[PDB]
């Protein structure tokens, strides 16, 4: 719980702009959806080997 | 940069397991790679419309 | 049954524009089709792991 | 904003299960992600016809 | 058999367009082909889960 | 409006069964999703020529 | 319309198998679907040459 | 044997035209090739599930 | 018209076994379908160069 | 061995044109290559069903 | 006309075995079909760049 | 090894042009690569049946 | 731990520009992501064999 | 020139495994191949926007 | 003309075994075919961009 | 060790172009990458028979 992360200005602006578009709610939503993408990709990877 | 966000225990464990495999260095690396994946998806999407 | 959702203005506009095409009937139809897509994605995901 | 939807017991259970997996936060998060999936499908579709 | 279904004006126009091209004979035919597609999808789905 | 169509005694059972799983609403909803699938298959196949 | 065609016993059995499954209604229906496939092939062909 | 089938006034012209190009023999030949195409599409699509 | 061909025993057996399946009618049908396949391959080839 | 086939003028012209391109030697060569193409198609097909 | 080629024993045996199978006539047939394959592959390559 | 075969002017020119591009050394190299392509096709084919 | 590598000036500038794009943090992060891509390509190669 | 970086024990073992296989000469070779792959990815990315 | 290259023992044995397989003539032929594969991979990369 | 081979002026220019781009270090690197590609091809080949 409560993890400290050091992101660049690029991804800060990216998260803010994703919030502005109305497609995402909070920054937690954006990061959790991106991590869902990454976890699904990794699960697809190890499904082979 | 230097922000604290409370993620679920599932995603905390996922990030830790990804770090323990040796592929990723820090949790910042994992979150940056996830954001890169999401940004590339969005770039492939909005390039059409 | 009888759930209250807080959707953004962007997603309300998306649902309305989907209804305007005539392909979908109501907002419930659009949300049900979206949940069907997500459930199919999950059923294809967890089939591996 | 403020939408009252009467989802079936199957979709209520699916939303609750996606919450319990730790991948999704709230029910609104699941519904927004499913709507994002449908929106991306349609954005890939209407780019052709 | 012999069921009353309120299809949207868009889908009514689509069924008429498919009929008047000569490729399909009746509205029952176009609906049966669409249901064949959907049943193939669902049978490929529930075979996994 | 409210078109009467003589479907086979097999697609009737399939529509009802798809309703029973809690994934679809009415028979009109299943028929509409199937017509959407046929329209999307059209748009994807007629994309070449 | 109303043409006499000598189809082989294999294709007669195939048309019957497609009919008695409930997915197709008449032999005209199965032949029309097959001709749709063949016409799509030829239209994609002669569009090139 | 020698089945009588009521095809539309459009597939009639298509069959004749395909005969006129010197690529097919009789109407039975065109119908047989189309049925072969449908059977092969079946064998290729039902290969997954 | 009225051409004499010197086919090997292997190809005579292939044509006969194709006729035995019921998908094709005569040896002329098999040879015509083979020439159609080769002509389609060529028409797709020379479309580039 | 020794097969008398009455090919249409279209296929006679196609065989002669394939001979004139310098890619094929005789008409029997073109017919054997087309039969090889059909045999490979069927060998790829029957491996599934 | 009349070109001298130095092939290994591997491809000599390969050409002879392709003749034995009845799929090819002479060694010229085998080599010309292989060169047709190579020319089609090269034409597909330079179709892009 | 050290065999003379009369190929068509088309294939002679094709081989010469392939040698002039600098990719292939001799005509033996070109014919060996073509035979490798055909042998790999045959290996992928007969591996099934 | 601690490995010395002499990369080209092209890759030096590329790594520095990837750091400057905000998508990557340090040079080690670019190297780790590239090695992840390489390992995933290897794994996808081993998917078939 | 002569830069020192510390990759994880995972990536150290990975580079050593790639060298002991004989495919890659130095660690510089493995890193340059990975950087080529990642540069291909990023260049395909930036071509859209 | 005349270039000196120090390849690994793995690739030395691989080239000698490819020569021994009868598929390739000399070491120069293996090297030229591998460089052809590499150039074709590059060209296929430039197909999109 | 220290083997000398003569590749064509085409392949000489190719290796030089790959070096001047900064992607590949030596000519040994380019040749080793090409040999890796060809070894992947041949290993995927021999896995069948």
Author numbering:
A (entry chain D), B (entry chain C), C (entry chain F), D (entry chain E), E (entry chain H), F (entry chain G), ...: 3 to 51
What does the article say, verbatim?
ParD2 is the antitoxin component of the parDE2 toxin–antitoxin module from Vibrio cholerae and consists of an ordered DNA-binding domain followed by an intrinsically disordered ParE-neutralizing domain. Like the more intensively studied CcdB, ParE poisons gyrase by stabilizing the so-called cleavable complex between gyrase and DNA. This leads to double-strand breaks, activation of the SOS response and ultimately, if the ParE toxin is not counteracted by the antitoxin ParD, cell death. In analogy to ParD from plasmid RK2 and ParD2 from M. tuberculosis, we predicted VcParD2 to be a DNA-binding protein that represses the parDE2 operon.
The VcParD2 sample formed crystals that diffracted to 3.1 Å resolution only after three months. The asymmetric unit contained four dimers of the N-terminal domain of VcParD2 and the corresponding models encompass residues Lys3–Arg51. The N-terminal two and C-terminal 32 residues are not visible in the electron-density map. Dimer formation buries about 1240 Å2 of mainly hydrophobic surface and creates the hydrophobic core of the protein. In the crystal, the VcParD2N dimers are found in a circular arrangement. This results in a torus consisting of eight VcParD22 dimers. The interface formed by adjacent VcParD22 dimers buries roughly 600 Å2. This interface is highly hydrophilic [PISA P(Δi G) value of 0.91] and is dominated by hydrogen bonds and salt bridges, and as such deviates from typical stable oligomerization interfaces. In contrast to SaCopG, VcParD2 does not associate into a helical structure, but forms a closed circle. The dimer–dimer association of VcParD2 is nevertheless very similar to that of SaCopG bound to DNA, suggesting that crystal packing may also reflect associations occurring on the DNA here.
